[PDB]
Amino acid sequence: ANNSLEQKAEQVLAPLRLSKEKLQDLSKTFSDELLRGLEMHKRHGLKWVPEECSLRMLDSCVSEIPTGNEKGVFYALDFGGTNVRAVRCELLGGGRIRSQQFLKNLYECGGEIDLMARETSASQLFDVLAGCVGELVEENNEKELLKKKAAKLGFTFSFPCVQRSLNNSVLESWTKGFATGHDTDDPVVGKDVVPLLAAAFARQGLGLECEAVVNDTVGTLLSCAYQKGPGGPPCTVGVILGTGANCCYWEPQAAAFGYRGAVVNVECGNFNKNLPTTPADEAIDNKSPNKKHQLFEKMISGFYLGELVRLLTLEIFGAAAPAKAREEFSFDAKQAAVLAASLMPGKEEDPALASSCKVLLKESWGWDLDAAALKVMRQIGFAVFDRSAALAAVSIAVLVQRTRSLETDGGVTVAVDGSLYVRNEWYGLRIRTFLKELLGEKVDKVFLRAADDGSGKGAAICVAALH
Ligand SMILES: OC[C@H]1O[C@H](O)[C@H](O)[C@@H](O)[C@H]1O
């Protein structure tokens, strides 16, 4: 019988099932790396030195954490790619916020102008960004009010930058397909984006003052801090587990290490020390456009989990694998989650979840596979997702410990957002299981809390907390 299939699956998947000792060792490695990063920051400031630390340990310049009692109307601009969003937030106190948003697809906004093109000027791009916010101001009939007294605005600008202060961030290089300004006298690269945005607001008569540029993880922490309610411990860790994976945290010795803010954007997706690398991980990195970078994220985030399932399927099934498994990106993290859900605690014998796996594999890969093969595929999906949760837990545990919040405040609130956590109830519970492995009984003082819209609401909250 081809029960060597089960032996092969065990051989291939065992290295993805991280032992307690392996997770503790990785926690130690990550904590040591974080300390090296603080020392790097103290020496080098705005200059990243990858030989000293794989973690950029960026100064967010955020020091003012909201209480939930702040009140007023605050705006945000979320520019992380072609899907731009303006947000308006009524901060009502008691942790309550009412939001509105306006969306623009940059592919449809130049008319006769490709906004992503090297021939497009900074002014043309920022005119469109400012116009997104202006459309929201006009929806609220607020343009004249804002001429009398400007509203404050936070800006999530999700590109590599050099940030000297909360309201001063210079674009280091374009990513994500953008090349705006490269062939003009009016570049974005090498310029502080805040004066460019301010000039565009002025050209439209818009009374908005950008007081912060904020990373999405920091916005996630701030969204949670405002909305959680005082009846619990402080929010000192922010986590995104979605298409990408990153965290931020409140650093108690920030001043001694040369930080202006207290919140550090770790950029831990690039963590690269003593990773539990498997051949599938090497294959994902080797064909990626960012070889040797984001190696921790490549084991964790939704962009990669489907690819992991696909490559492991090919490794385990060989000539029995379906033809579509040979196609890059043919299987995504939502599909992998269907597989993993069927092997979560208490669900291993659930017929409906297993049936959903059979239906999925027929639809996505045209694979009319037998019972033994179906069980193996479920095990592959489970192994990939459970490793993502375990590694996320390592990062959370190390940051929780570094905040000292358990010692100083008796507990900690960890803000979490991102599709892996939001779409899969069991994912956070797996994270908590691994956190208990890492932290012991004091995990009962750690509270994972869903936090929404760090890139919009969170940036508006950032500027509201400055008052
Ligand atoms: O969006 C989540 C996450 O994605 C990547 O890791 C980016 O490098 C980070 O800035 C981060 O915040």
Side-chain angles (χ1 to χ4, degrees):
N2 171 228
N3 169 91
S4 47
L5 175 71
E6 291 73 8
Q7 265 144 40
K8 182 64 169 151
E10 173 68 23
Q11 178 264 298
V12 170
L13 299 177
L16 281 92
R17 303 171 172 145
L18 304 178
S19 68
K20 297 168 185 305
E21 175 181 13
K22 287 210 68 187
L23 286 173
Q24 291 282 7
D25 290 349
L26 196 58
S27 178
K28 175 64 174 344
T29 302
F30 187 61
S31 170
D32 287 346
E33 188 76 336
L34 195 79
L35 293 166
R36 292 182 193 112
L38 295 170
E39 296 290 345
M40 175 189 72
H41 190 87
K42 175 175 175 179
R43 271 179 227 113
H44 300 291
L46 294 173
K47 180 173 132 208
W48 183 38
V49 181
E51 322 96 87
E52 288 185 21
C53 192
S54 65
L55 314 173
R56 287 172 183 264
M57 302 294 281
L58 298 175
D59 188 359
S60 71
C61 302
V62 173
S63 303
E64 308 307 322
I65 309 299
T67 61
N69 300 315
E70 300 87 353
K71 290 184 184 169
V73 178
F74 298 89
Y75 282 80
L77 174 64
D78 172 4
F79 173 31
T82 53
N83 293 319
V84 170
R85 287 168 75 218
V87 187
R88 181 187 179 270
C89 297
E90 298 185 31
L91 268 57
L92 299 171
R96 297 176 46 244
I97 299 177
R98 192 181 307 267
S99 295
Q100 291 174 44
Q101 67 177 1
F102 182 73
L103 269 66
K104 263 202 212 164
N105 181 0
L106 288 191
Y107 288 129
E108 272 314 320
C109 285
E112 194 127 324
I113 297 97
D114 176 1
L115 294 167
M116 281 58 67
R118 325 182 91 249
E119 302 92 349
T120 300
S121 67
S123 298
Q124 286 171 310
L125 173 63
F126 281 78
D127 278 347
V128 169
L129 299 179
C132 195
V133 194
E135 283 248 36
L136 194 54
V137 168
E138 287 180 358
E139 286 296 303
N140 284 272
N141 296 331
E142 294 203 312
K143 190 169 187 172
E144 296 305 308
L145 284 155
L146 295 189
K147 288 186 190 181
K148 181 172 184 188
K149 185 177 200 298
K152 308 308 193 170
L153 176 144
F155 185 21
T156 303
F157 181 62
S158 304
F159 300 93
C161 292
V162 175
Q163 180 162 23
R164 289 165 172 85
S165 68
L166 187 54
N167 74 327
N168 185 323
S169 193
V170 173
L171 176 65
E172 186 175 61
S173 77
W174 277 125
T175 60
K176 301 161 177 194
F178 283 75
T180 312
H182 279 316
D183 287 357
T184 77
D185 290 343
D186 189 19
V188 189
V189 172
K191 297 297 188 169
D192 182 3
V193 297
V194 171
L196 290 171
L197 187 62
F201 289 145
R203 290 188 294 268
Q204 292 186 43
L206 289 167
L208 296 155
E209 296 185 351
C210 179
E211 295 189 324
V213 183
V214 183
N215 177 256
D216 60 0
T217 67
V218 176
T220 300
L221 182 156
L222 297 168
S223 172
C224 185
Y226 188 92
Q227 294 177 108
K228 66 182 185 61
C235 183
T236 53
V237 183
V239 175
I240 291 175
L241 294 161
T243 298
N246 186 28
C247 308
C248 70
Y249 77 103
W250 191 88
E251 169 50 58
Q253 299 185 275
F257 287 105
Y259 287 88
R260 282 118 178 116
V263 178
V264 177
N265 168 13
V266 178
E267 290 293 340
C268 48
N270 197 57
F271 179 53
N272 66 4
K273 302 301 193 295
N274 203 34
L275 299 187
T277 303
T278 72
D281 298 304
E282 293 183 290
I284 282 176
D285 184 45
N286 286 341
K287 70 188 178 63
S288 76
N290 65 334
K291 293 170 62 174
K292 299 299 193 178
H293 286 118
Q294 300 304 106
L295 290 171
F296 194 58
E297 172 173 84
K298 281 163 171 167
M299 299 180 165
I300 296 171
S301 79
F303 191 93
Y304 300 101
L305 296 192
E307 278 293 276
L308 280 164
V309 172
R310 184 182 68 80
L311 288 159
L312 291 166
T313 298
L314 293 160
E315 190 174 356
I316 290 164
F317 285 89
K324 192 54 93 135
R326 300 175 68 193
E327 163 149 1
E328 248 191 291
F329 301 112
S330 66
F331 199 83
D332 69 29
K334 180 170 165 162
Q335 298 170 311
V338 174
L339 302 175
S342 79
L343 284 167
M344 289 293 147
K347 303 302 189 156
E348 307 96 325
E349 297 86 34
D350 185 305
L353 293 169
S355 174
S356 293
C357 297
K358 187 183 198 302
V359 169
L360 163 62
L361 293 167
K362 186 217 189 163
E363 202 278 347
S364 62
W365 282 344
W367 192 9
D368 180 17
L369 81 177
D370 69 16
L374 182 58
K375 181 66 179 298
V376 167
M377 282 303 310
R378 292 168 55 213
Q379 290 172 320
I380 295 171
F382 179 86
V384 166
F385 249 103
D386 211 41
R387 185 180 70 159
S388 171
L391 294 176
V394 170
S395 71
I396 291 163
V398 169
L399 298 191
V400 162
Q401 290 173 304
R402 186 71 198 164
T403 67
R404 297 177 36 74
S405 292
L406 300 178
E407 295 105 307
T408 62
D409 297 81
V412 64
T413 299
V414 178
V416 191
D417 195 21
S419 59
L420 300 179
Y421 186 91
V422 170
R423 296 181 49 91
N424 310 121
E425 146 267 335
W426 44 259
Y427 185 70
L429 295 179
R430 294 307 293 170
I431 293 174
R432 283 197 62 79
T433 297
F434 292 114
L435 287 177
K436 181 188 278 227
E437 294 191 359
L438 290 163
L439 300 173
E441 288 310 284
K442 68 196 162 133
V443 73
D444 69 352
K445 298 166 191 54
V446 175
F447 301 91
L448 308 184
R449 291 288 179 271
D452 66 312
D453 192 24
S455 60
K457 177 185 294 187
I461 291 163
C462 179
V463 300
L466 302 174
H467 183 26

